[PDB]
Amino acid sequence: KLILASTSPWRRALLEKLQISFECAAPEVDETPRSDESPRQLVLRLAQEKAQSLASRYPDHLIIGSAQVCVLDGEITTEENARLQLRKASGNIVTFYTGLALFNSANGHLQTEVEPFDVHFRHLSEAEIDNYVRKFKSEGFGITLFERLEGRDPNTLVGLPLIALCQMLRREGKNPLM
Amino acid sequence: KLILASTSPWRRALLEKLQISFECAAPEVDETPRSDESPRQLVLRLAQEKAQSLASRYPDHLIIGSAQVCVLDGEITGKPLTEENARLQLRKASGNIVTFYTGLALFNSANGHLQTEVEPFDVHFRHLSEAEIDNYVRKEHPLHCAGSFKSEGFGITLFERLEGRDPNTLVGLPLIALCQMLRREGKNPLM
């Protein structure tokens, strides 16, 4: 009944927390941002399309779609760039936007939500940045780079807004608790 | 050089995230709350005491101590132990905020420098039905979790939002705060 339109092992792991059986499937959606598209609009669209793209292969199902980007001074986002990309993040608040869609392919009902999560980075030195790339995992070693994590749900940062998903599931009469 | 003064397997797992060599040892402390001791005073005291209790065993080291308490309507709340008490705790949590205070201490036994901090984390609950409460307890059996839920797992099904500096703090070790203390002692995990 429940389908995750993703082959991400992180998203898979997160969904397993809800203890509802599901199957994974790759959506094969082009995630390239459009010209005048905001971060919020983009992940919203991508979440929806990923869920809707599987509707014929899984035509009597609740299909979960999700997408995430981060914004580094208003820009949507090799080991070579990480040095710069961490250099860009340094001393700044980097906002992640995570879109979520639950599509009922049986009756066409769609629920969507976009949830922000702010990562406040420490002022980093070049050495730190170098050392870190030599060795981001917000649930792991990336904690060494942060001053503060600010958002509704730490699962969102990892890539699936589970609190929001539970609400959507409750609306579809599939409270994980029942 | 780094020592974790803890009998907790999850504190060990969390500290590993920093990728610094350490050893664990069980601390020697009275964990009993004292009379009129507030939740924040308790976890600060216990964190400092755990770290300091290993100073003679580990006299040239950085020693980490930590303690956590769960607070519901101003009252320290322990492990439920029974299903009845688990349902009771969750009724108290329902539509409410559960606050965890996590004390942290780093004691340098070589130069005697002690750093301590208490960091809160607030778990905002949904308004839960009796059926939801009964189902969670039966599925999860959180009988040895103070507050009667597991935030890192199926407990996410109960929450409206999570409010705090660092998700690790909720799991029982404030890692952002610990990193700061380690840097202050010239032991940056990134160095």
Author numbering:
A (entry chain B): 3 to 79, 84 to 141, 151 to 193
B (entry chain A): 3 to 193
Publication passage describing the model:
Screening of Maf proteins for pyrophosphatase activity against a set of 57 noncanonical or modified nucleoside triphosphates revealed that the YhdE-like Maf proteins (E. coli YhdE, BSU28050, YOR111W, and ASMTL-Maf) also exhibited high pyrophosphatase activity against 5-methyl-UTP (m5UTP or riboTTP), pseudouridine triphosphate (pseudo-UTP or Ψ), and 5-methyl-CTP (m5CTP), whereas the two YceF proteins (from E. coli and S. typhimurium) were active toward 7-methyl-GTP (m7GTP). The Michaelis-Menten constant, KM, of the YhdE-like proteins toward canonical pyrimidine nucleotides varied in a micromolar range: 32.7–53.0 μM for dTTP; 29.7–72.4 μM for UTP; and it was lower (to a lesser extent for ASMTL-Maf) with modified nucleotides (4.7–47.2 μM). Both YceF proteins also showed high affinity to m7GTP (32.8 μM for YceF and 30.9 μM for STM1189). Therefore, we propose that the unprotonated Asp88 of ASMTL-Maf (Asp70 in YhdE, Asp103 in YOR111W, Asp70 in BSU28050, and Asp69 in YceF) functions as a general base coordinating a water molecule to produce a nucleophilic hydroxide ion, which attacks the alpha-phosphate of the substrate. This is supported by the complete loss of activity in the ASMTL-Maf D88A (and D88N), YhdE D70A, YOR111W D103A, BSU28050 D70A, and YceF D69A mutant proteins. The structure of the inactive YceF D69A protein showed no changes in the position of the side chains of other residues in the active sites, suggesting that the loss of activity in this protein is caused by the replacement of the catalytic Asp69 by Ala. Alanine replacement mutagenesis of the predicted triphosphate binding residues in ASMTL-Maf (Arg24, Lys65, Lys100), YOR111W (Arg30, Lys74, Lys116), YhdE (Arg13, Lys52, Lys82), BSU28050 (Arg14, Lys53, Lys82), and YceF (Arg13, Lys52, Lys81) produced inactive proteins, confirming that these residues play an important role in activity of Maf proteins and suggesting that they are likely to be involved in the coordination of the triphosphate part of the substrate.
Maf (for multicopy associated filamentation) proteins represent a large family of conserved proteins implicated in cell division arrest but whose biochemical activity remains unknown. Here, we show that the prokaryotic and eukaryotic Maf proteins exhibit nucleotide pyrophosphatase activity against 5-methyl-UTP, pseudo-UTP, 5-methyl-CTP, and 7-methyl-GTP, which represent the most abundant modified bases in all organisms, as well as against canonical nucleotides dTTP, UTP, and CTP. The protomer structures of the four Maf proteins revealed a large β sheet containing seven β strands (β1 to β7) with two α-helical subdomains on one side and one long α helix on another side. Thus, pyrophosphatase activity of Maf proteins toward canonical and modified nucleotides might provide the molecular mechanism for a dual role of these proteins in cell division arrest and house cleaning.
